[PDB]
Write a protein that binds this ligand. Structure first.
Ligand code: BKR
Ligand code: BKR
Ligand SMILES: *[C@@H]1O[C@H](CO)[C@@H](O[C@@H]2O[C@H](CO)[C@@H](O)[C@H](O)[C@H]2NC(C)=O)[C@H](O)[C@H]1NC(C)=O
Ligand SMILES: *[C@@H]1O[C@H](CO)[C@@H](O[C@@H]2O[C@H](CO)[C@@H](O)[C@H](O)[C@H]2NC(C)=O)[C@H](O)[C@H]1NC(C)=O
Ligand SMILES: *[C@@H]1O[C@H](CO)[C@@H](O[C@@H]2O[C@H](CO)[C@@H](O)[C@H](O)[C@H]2NC(C)=O)[C@H](O)[C@H]1NC(C)=O
Ligand SMILES: *[C@@H]1O[C@H](CO)[C@@H](O[C@@H]2O[C@H](CO)[C@@H](O)[C@H](O)[C@H]2NC(C)=O)[C@H](O)[C@H]1NC(C)=O
Ligand SMILES: *[C@@H]1O[C@H](CO)[C@@H](O[C@@H]2O[C@H](CO)[C@@H](O)[C@H](O)[C@H]2NC(C)=O)[C@H](O)[C@H]1NC(C)=O
Ligand SMILES: CC(=O)N[C@H]1[C@H](O[C@@H]2[C@H](O)[C@@H](O)O[C@H](CO)[C@H]2O)O[C@H](CO)[C@@H](O)[C@@H]1O
Ligand code: NAG
Ligand code: NAG
Ligand code: NAG
Ligand code: NAG
Ligand code: NAG
Ligand code: NAG
Ligand code: XLS
Ligand code: XLS
Lengths: 757, 756
């Protein structure tokens, strides 16, 4: 190609491990090479073939980004989306470390996690956006770094996903050939057509952080880029990833991401998954085929040895040889695809439940409050919505990927979304249970209508008879979405529209709580004065109720803020966010460039209902004394691995990630109660066609009492004030005035100053 | 798009600006239009008086070798000739001498020097000889010192010609005479120049002229991106008056103004020659400007700023407290001006000696197989009309040295043709000086100075004379002039046939060339009968006496070439001279910064003689290259400052600060004493950069055999900078800079690396 494959060298932290992988790979025969480099049958989502002669075992690759999927004896962690709404780096890390402990203890070698910027968030309808974090390169980047580090700090290799520009589910069109029908014969995958500036500034940003953390592996995506399959795109894999980001680890296909044998082998793919698993229905392009291609001379053997060095580097780095993971005991594929019995192991540790609850309490985001919260001691409480209670069939009734219950089933509290990113629950702590516990301590009465208000005989009349005398009425709403489809619009799931219409008819103190994978349409009720409060709780995992109720009653003040923009209409967002076509070669031209989510809204002067980084507290905060400390710089010492990203200011002993200055401000608690506050920093980088403002810092001040002040600090790296030059092929700091802005949301920025290089 | 910045006097003109501003505040509108446009008089241009306020007419006078068209002066060597000395002391002394003569003849404003237009995009440019080096850095230095020399005498300078004025062909000055108008035939050549080329190449020497304190700048005849230079708002209001912070006046060239209002809004200050020369060269201001101001289409405050700029120089040079004496010569000529001339002799003791010293220091030895220096030859032959006088007299060719007949034997080429020539009180011919020396040695000497192709018996004379000569000198010339480019490199007159004859009948031919530029000597340069070749450029009045001491070894040659001598015209920058009859003729400067040696170095072309080449009667060894990063210093001594933006500007900083110095050692490693010009080149890193760029020179005088001397090259911030088109400032790029020191642009035995 224009774009050859560089040999791994282990880079910074993996040098000893690389040396060991190389010795090992040097001893391997050609058939052994093809064994490790492709999937085999087993209990985990994927499993690499052993090298039995050299004592290298099968590796278990296991979903997913909330913790091991399809296993018992584990915990159901909150989604990436939930942890992002915390804006709390300490929780991002702790979440990942805790997940990591469960992956390791269940016997997993390679976790298929985290989601580090694919999907990032170009459409708010993406059915899997929830697995990610923030709709913003900088914040996604930070969360990715910590998610990768928490996982690797436990025993577990990571597979950061999905590289790259994987921004819609519709027409993702994975390769499958089952019962005589092949995707190849119907429609090729969505092609993301992305300019060079958009790729560096937007989509590669989080991956760069994931490498720096360093992820052991990267999963390539289902989409094509510029009409070439991501999994065999030489520019993407060989040049952008293995050269500019200097990635020393392995590229793993997504399951059905590999569409051909030879292009994938020359153009950057290291591991073909799932290979013989899943009946070979997702393609099985390597294995014996790859042996035959090497021996008949059409694929370089040395190219394939490199693939193996990259897979083994992880094994040796994480010490899986000298401290092997225990046996993986659960059948996670499911019968009749795999007929194999499951054992049982319990890996739930003390502390985990309390961590999941803490993330919940730290993320719930308060969007409207007219004075009804915090609750005092209300004596008569009504509760509406099947979201307040259990799945009528059991918390795990929807099966191994939380997606198999009937279209009209009452799924109960939405604690995670559908797909390969879900996990099972040992229990669900329901909002109704936790409210009732509180009602009981206050000698109060509480009643819930949890039926489908449209279809259950008597439900509407039960609601009308219950609500008028309630002191407060909680309505729980939800909006399930899942991998493999995008949401068609912002409509609430189930009967939620109906429930809202009945609620505001019969009560003047409606508190609304939404469990959701993404933005929903609340335009019909949001300005109704009967709705005194609105909170979004995202996807809380198993501790749904006990994390929400302390916030409602004021034991702690809400402190979560939105990790994406909540527009009034789907029409306000980036146009053509989801392309639907029956064309053989479907096309998505990313013509918006870097302008996604809030940058789109700010550029077009569109006012969202709730902006990026919005969230209320039970107190108020005053910002003061913006300082730009030009003397507070520091060499980037601490990364696990280094990129080779070029940049104008390079010399011998220099980095794109050096801190070039630090900025400070002060916040004062100006209300009547203690609260935490998420401070945000935005920079306006000069140049043509630049976003109005780009997030470049956040800092969460915890439990700031009434009248007290605290200083927030924002280290600014060289990259943070840089632009990608498409003409030179490098990062540079533009000349001009940069506006530095600090405050409580993307549109609530009382403090501003100018910085010039 | 580009508003006109008001003058403020800047650095050294503050007190003069204040006086200027005051006088102009009192002027009526008619007085404003009087001072800002040309009137009739004895000098090349004359501003109108403002007689109520006691401001006299100012005399603007040609040209860059001294006051043109006067008697009683000396003929100085041309720009080209002083450039070949590579000697800053002589660059300054020459200017200071010209200045003294300018002042003493009555000139307020000298139409001098030439400071980077023409710079040298074509080696055929008919007026390239008026300038100095085909190189921005060296032209820069020469420009600075020439301005300084002229201003230190009583004279205001008009540095010229701004800008990108790189061919005479289709220069197409404005003229309307006997009913035919240039405007109806052809617009001027349009120099289309990209932004980096303009900053890195063409503006360089003008920036130096600004810093030196030039009082004014003359806009050129060409257009730039299809807009006339004298009404180019990007050129005059932005590039010159903003980025270069120029506080003085912009004077039109004579016929350079094509309109009334665009010129007044876009940065012109002085319309010349106005009523002069029969108003034939347009007369767009004057009473027309008065009318434009009165009816409100031209702002009066705008015009007051023109007038301020003109008067600042008057007051700065103290021309009110010490006025020049009256100008007494008719330099325009009858019938255009019928006015009698008086007489003044301004030639001072020491000027003839200075003119001789520049010739001796500039003559450049290109080849020597062992015939030079002469010892005491007994039988000397001399060929060529270049060896003696113009058969009609040194000044027969008139006020611009350009009116003799195409076939006239003009004798020794001491200056070129045009507005930058000057009259001579005498010519010391090469033949007279050779004879004087022959007579000391008791020798015989005979000269064949007729036209060897056209005069009965010349060929047979040459054939009978040369076989018995111990040495044959052949004197060659190539005349060129303003208003035309040379069609090719061929020698003037009978020169080719002279050379064919000389090498047929003699095996010791020493060739001396007097020339405005590169010539074609391919047919003879490698003939072993030609034992030496020297180029003496345009030596002014002391042609013979400057040359003969060098030939006989009283002093070794020390001159080196100020431009590249390629083997063929095809080896230079393509499209150097565009020839078309198109109404809007175009010259696309696609070569960018790559002119003269930069072109040759980038295309892998070997010249016959490289830029900065010249032999000595001895040899030099270079050693011990030192880059002293500790030897830095603040820019303190400029007369005026620019406002050129640069990335490293803080409060109290300059683009002209010395950031480091380089040193090297030279050893005279031959058998005779000699002077050496050491040169420094720097390879600035980046995209499409020249291989090498001159960034210094230092001439060591008369180094004795076996002796060593240290050569010193201060390096300014601008000297290692690149212009960023994206950011619109100068920056020092990152990467490795190669620093090379040596005797020519292709003989660089020392090199080292500097990274910042
Ligand atoms: C297509 C697909 O994604 O399959 C995989 C198996 O590896 C893929 C990765 C994926 O993350 C995984 C494990 C999941 O976890 C998904 O959540 C997941 C899916 C999205 C789902 O896939 C779909 O709904 C497909 O659109 C659907 N596709 C089609 O029917 C189809 C067939 C031919 C041409 C074009 C399309 C399908 C349904 C059932 C079996 C295979 C394919 C299958 C699948 O059973 C799950 O699929 C299987 O368990 C399975 C696949 C093939 C053979 C036997 C079992 C699914 C679940 C768990 C429901
Ligand atoms: C055209 C031109 O450059 O004229 C000037 C006068 O100011 C100009 C500046 C220039 O430096 C100056 C003084 C010179 O010194 C030049 O060396 C110089 C010239 C270049 C020369 O001009 C030319 O040869 C022109 O190409 C020539 N041009 C044309 O004939 C012509 C006519 C109509 C349309 C287009 C072109 C010309 C000859 C004679 C008189 C006017 C113009 C005129 C001129 O006589 C000299 O011109 C005059 O003395 C003069 C001009 C106009 C009317 C009367 C006298 C010349 C000399 C001294 C010979
Ligand atoms: C290629 O991979 C397969 C599957 O991992 C290896 O076969 C397994 O070998 C292990 C020992 O490491 C046995 O306990 C399993 O029974 C085998 N599984 C099956 C399905 O046969 C196989 O040995 C590997 N081949 C090579 C050449 O190393
Ligand atoms: C309950 O969960 C089930 C899945 O476990 C949801 O049913 C899927 O809904 C999507 C819409 O997002 C459809 O595209 C699928 O066809 C449904 N799956 C099946 C197997 O039918 C269901 O919508 C959820 N219930 C509610 C009220 O939202
Ligand atoms: C405009 O300028 C002209 C020409 O310089 C001035 O006329 C001359 O005035 C001087 C004194 O400054 C006299 O000695 C000359 O006799 C005049 N010459 C001619 C040709 O008339 C004129 O005075 C100026 N106009 C103004 C308003 O100052
Ligand atoms: C002549 O035209 C060129 C070509 O447009 C001009 O160069 C541009 O200058 C501006 C600054 O004024 C830059 O932002 C552009 O990038 C330049 N383009 C190139 C290709 O160099 C130049 O300024 C014009 N010169 C004049 C005197 O008008
Ligand atoms: C002697 O000088 C005269 C000028 O005074 C030269 O004649 C001019 O030559 C150019 C070509 O270089 C012609 O375009 C002009 O038309 C000529 N001028 C006149 C007035 O006829 C002449 O060429 C010189 N003699 C030699 C031998 O070079
Ligand atoms: C620093 C430099 O040399 N830049 C280029 C310049 O072209 C400019 C520049 O890229 C920028 O401001 O955008 C304008 C408008 O598109 C563009 O013209 O000039 C030369 C042309 O001689 C480019 O090739 C340079 O690379
Ligand atoms: C899997 C397989 O059989 N690959 C073969 C390869 O061995 C050879 C080539 C023809 O030389 O044809 C390929 O299909
Ligand atoms: C020389 C002259 O008078 N120029 C006139 C100006 O006075 C007025 C204008 C019309 O208002 O027309 C211009 O041509
Ligand atoms: C200042 C100037 O002369 N010209 C432009 C200007 O439009 C732009 O704002 C600036 C950025 O600093 O750079 C140049 O591209
Ligand atoms: C608010 O609720 C009351 C019943 O409590 C009802 O009478 C009224 O119509 C409701 N208002 C709106 C705007 O829905
Ligand atoms: C100069 O005198 C001549 C007569 O020899 C005449 O033709 C011409 O017009 C006069 N010139 C001027 C400018 O008056
Ligand atoms: C050199 O000169 C001699 C006369 O001395 C002549 O015979 C010979 O042909 C000439 N050689 C060349 C190469 O012109
Ligand atoms: O894209 C889906 C998931 O991210 C991936 O982990 C595999 O498909 C295995 O289920
Ligand atoms: O361009 C020619 C000369 O440089 C200039 O000084 C004037 O034209 C006056 O003769």
């Amino acid at each position: 190609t224009q774009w050859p494959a560089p040999l791994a060298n282990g880079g910074k932290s993996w040098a000893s491990a690389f040396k060991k992988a190389k010795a090992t790979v040097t001893e391997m025969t050609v058939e052994e090479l093809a064994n490790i480099t492709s999937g085999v049958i087993g209990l985990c989502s994927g499993v690499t073939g052993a090298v039995t002669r050299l004592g290298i075992p099968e590796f278990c690759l296991q979903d997913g980004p909330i913790g091991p999927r399809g296993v018992h004896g584990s915990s159901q962690f909150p989604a990436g989306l939930t942890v992002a709404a915390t804006w709390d780096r300490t929780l991002m890390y702790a979440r990942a470390r805790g997940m990591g402990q469960e992956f390791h203890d269940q016997g997993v070698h390679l976790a298929l996690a985290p989601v580090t910027g694919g999907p990032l968030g170009r459409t708010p309808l993406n059915g899997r956006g929830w697995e990610g974090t923030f709709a913003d390169p900088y914040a996604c980047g930070e969360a990715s770094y910590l998610s990768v580090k928490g996982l690797t700090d436990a025993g577990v290799a990571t597979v950061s996903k999905h590289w790259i520009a994987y921004e819609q589910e519709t027409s993702r069109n994975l390769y499958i050939d089952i019962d005589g029908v092949s995707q190849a014969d119907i429609q090729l995958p969505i092609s993301s057509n992305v300019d060079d500036l958009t790729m560096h500034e937007l989509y590669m940003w989080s991956f760069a952080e994931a490498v720096r953390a360093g992820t052991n592996h990267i999963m390539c995506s289902y989409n094509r880029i510029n009409n070439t399959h991501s999994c065999s795109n030489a520019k993407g894999l060989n040049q952008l990833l293995k050269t500019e980001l200097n990635f020393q680890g392995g590229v793993v296909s997504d399951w059905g991401g590999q569409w051909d044998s030879v292009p994938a082998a020359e153009n950057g793919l290291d591991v073909a998954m799932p290979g013989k698993g899943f009946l070979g229905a997702l393609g099985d392009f390597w294995g014996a085929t790859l042996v035959e291609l090497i021996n008949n001379g059409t694929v370089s053997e040395d190219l394939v040895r490199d693939k193996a060095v990259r897979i083994l580097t992880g094994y040796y780095y994480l010490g899986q040889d000298t401290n092997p993971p225990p046996p993986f005991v659960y059948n996670t594929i499911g019968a009749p695809t795999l007929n194999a019995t499951s054992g049982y192991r319990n890996v739930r540790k003390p502390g985990t439940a309390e961590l999941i609850k803490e993330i919940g309490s730290a993320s719930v985001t308060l969007l409207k409050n007219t004075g009804s919260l915090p609750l005092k001691h209300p004596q008569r409480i009504a509760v509406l919505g099947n979201d307040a209670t259990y799945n009528v069939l059991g918390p795990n009734a929807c099966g191994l990927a939380n997606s198999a219950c009937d279209i009209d089933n009452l799924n109960g509290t939405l604690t995670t979304g559908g797909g390969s990113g879900s996990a099972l629950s040992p229990y669900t702590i329901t909002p109704l249970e936790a409210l009732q516990k509180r009602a009981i301590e206050d000698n109060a009465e509480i009643a819930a209508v949890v039926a489908n208000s449209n279809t259950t005989t008597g439900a509407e009349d039960a609601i009308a008879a219950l609500l008028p005398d309630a002191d407060v009425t909680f309505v729980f709403l939800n909006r399930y979405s899942e991998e493999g489809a995008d949401a068609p619009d912002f409509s609430l799931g189930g009967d939620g529209d109906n429930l809202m219409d009945l609620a505001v008819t019969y009560s003047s103190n409606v508190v609304v709580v939404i469990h959701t994978t993404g933005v929903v349409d609340i335009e019909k009720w949001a300005d109704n004065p009967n709705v005194t409060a609105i909170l979004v709780a995202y996807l809380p995992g198993q501790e749904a109720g006990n994390s929400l109720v302390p916030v409602l009653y004021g034991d702690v003040a809400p402190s979560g803020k939105l990790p994406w923009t909540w527009g009034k209409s789907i029409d306000d967002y980036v146009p053509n966010g989801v392309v639907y076509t029956d064309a053989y070669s479907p096309q998505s031209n990313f013509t918006e460039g870097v302008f996604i989510d809030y940058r789109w809204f700010d550029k077009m002067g569109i006012t969202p209902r709730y902006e990026f980084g919005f969230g209320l507290s039970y107190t108020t905060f005053t910002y003061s004394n913006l300082i730009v400390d030009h003397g507070r710089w520091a060499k980037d010492y601490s990364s696990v691995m280094e990129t080779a990203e070029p940049f104008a200011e390079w010399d011998g002993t220099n980095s794109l990630y050096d801190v070039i200055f630090t900025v400070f401000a002060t916040i004062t608690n100006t209300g009547n109660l203690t609260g935490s506050e998420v401070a945000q920093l935005y920079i306006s980088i000069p140049g043509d066609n630049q976003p109005v403002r780009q997030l470049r810092g956040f800092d969460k001040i915890k439990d700031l009492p009434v009248g007290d002040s605290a200083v927030v600090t924002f280290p600014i790296r060289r990259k943070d004030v840089s632009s990608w030059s498409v003409v030179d092929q490098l990062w540079y700091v533009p000349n001009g005035d940069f506006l530095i802005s600090v405050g409580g949301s993307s549109r609530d920025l009382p403090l501003n100053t100018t910085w010039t290089p």
